[PDB]
Amino acid sequence: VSLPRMVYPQPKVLTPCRKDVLVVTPWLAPIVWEGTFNIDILNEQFRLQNTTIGLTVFAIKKYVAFLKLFLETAEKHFMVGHRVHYYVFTDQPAAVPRVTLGTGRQLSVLEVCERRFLSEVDYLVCVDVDMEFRDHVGVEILTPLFGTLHPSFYGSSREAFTYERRPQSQAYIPKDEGDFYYMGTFFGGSVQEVQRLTRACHQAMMVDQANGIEAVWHDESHLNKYLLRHKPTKVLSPEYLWDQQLLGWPAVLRKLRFTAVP
Ligand SMILES: [Hg+2]
Ligand SMILES: [Hg+2]
Ligand SMILES: [Hg+2]
Ligand SMILES: [Hg+2]
């Protein structure tokens, strides 16, 4: 469908969008920083497709305590105006707080890549519960396949990346390979691409088990190997995954959108 008439500043062909950061990968995937996107344009494009976003979180044992703040802040900041289905995976279904949701937003509690996700959402976003949203996280992230730059490693050279370095692991990446170091959380994409990813990692991890080896950073090591060989269609800047107690608030981050809880 066509967009309506809209009034916004003209893009400036001869002005770089940012002079401080890389805003596109060498496979031409956007890297999402504040200033790169017009949110009104993007909201129109996604609303016109009647987009549903699923948000999955695991909350097991003590981690259930974090659900209240997680959901309440997602309600303020996550995909506001779009259809959202939260999927909470928990060992304690009765301890899930009753959080009031906006219209068009729903929550399922699943007691601990089901096909149920295909018929229900267009995109899946996979995060941890011990976080809170502090600023806009919206449709600018949505794409067939995305990962987020680990906040501790975005300025690192590939040699310093904590990839799995042992050739006997399926997650092995040598010193002369690697684009970015993606954090093993906050990834997502179309349901198809997310299921392909989780299926690949799950098979690689079982191969490692049979061979008596466990990757240095577990799930995250294997995510890094997957996204090296299957380039994400967007990459999110560390605005999308921050720890301000550990890392402060550098000038390169104009927004801190989704952050560790004390
Ligand atoms: Hg710009
Ligand atoms: Hg997921
Ligand atoms: Hg896995
Ligand atoms: Hg993975």
Q: What is the CATH number of the domain that holds 104?
A: 3.90.550.10
Q: Give the resolution value in Å.
A: 2.0
Instruction: Say how far apart CA 127 and CA 236 lie, in whole Å.
Output: 13
Residue 92: partners with Cβ closer than 8 Å, 6 or more residues away: 59, 60, 61, 64
**Ligand 2 centroid from CA 154, angstroms:** 23
Segments forming the whole domain that contains residue 127 = 1-262
Token look-up 């995109």 returns: 123
- Note whether 255 and 34 are within 8 A (CB): yes
| Method used to obtain the model | X-ray
CB neighbour list of residue 83: distance below 8 Å, 6 or more residues apart: 50, 51, 52, 53, 104, 105
Binding residue per annotation — 117?
no
Ligand nearest to the CA of 16: 1
Is 8 flagged in the annotation as binding?
no
- Give 84-143 as a DSSP string: EEEEEEES-GGGS---PPPTTEEEEEEE---THHHHH-SEEEEEESSEEE-S-B-GGG-S
Number of separate domains in the chain: 1
132 catalytically annotated: no
Any idea which ligand is nearest the CA of 21? 1
